[PDB]
Structure 1
Amino acid sequence: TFPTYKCPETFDAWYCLNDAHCFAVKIADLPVYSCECAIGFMGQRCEYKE
């Protein structure tokens, strides 16, 4: 399991939608930012109301 970290500020502010939370991992020295969606939402930015 990869540890997760707080996102940089621009990502933390704007990237994840619909009350989703941004989280960062580092894979082979590269930061990858992702969104943990609230229930009922899906997508890269949790932009789709599933």
Structure 2
Amino acid sequence: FPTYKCPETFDAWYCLNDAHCFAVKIADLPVYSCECAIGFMGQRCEYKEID
């Protein structure tokens, strides 16, 4: 399930709160999404998880 590095600008600045950026191409389009750090969720990992 192949995943690639984001453009520098996205890699550095897209994901917040110590998340990691990953990129997929779907239908020849780059989709930049993120792997959230423990306790965060949201698209840019911006929201704190509630128990």
- Fold shared by both chains (TM-score > 0.5): yes
Residue by residue, what CA displacement relative to the aligned partner does 1:1-50 show, whole Å, maximum 9, x if unpaired?
A: x4100000111111101110000001010010001001100001000111
Distance 1:11 1:18 in 2: 14
Which protein shows a greater Rg? 2
Q: Following the alignment from structure 1 to structure 2, what is the Cα–Cα distance between the partners of residues 42 and 27?
A: 22
Supply the distance in 1 between the matched residues of 2:29 and 2:2 (Cα, whole angstroms): 13
Percentage of matched positions with identical amino acids: 100
1:10 alignment counterpart = 9
Could you state the TM-score of these two structures normalised by the residue count of structure 1?
Answer: 0.91
**Over aligned residues, Cα RMSD in angstroms?**
0.8
Moved over 4 A (4+): none
TM-score, scaled relative to structure 2: 0.89
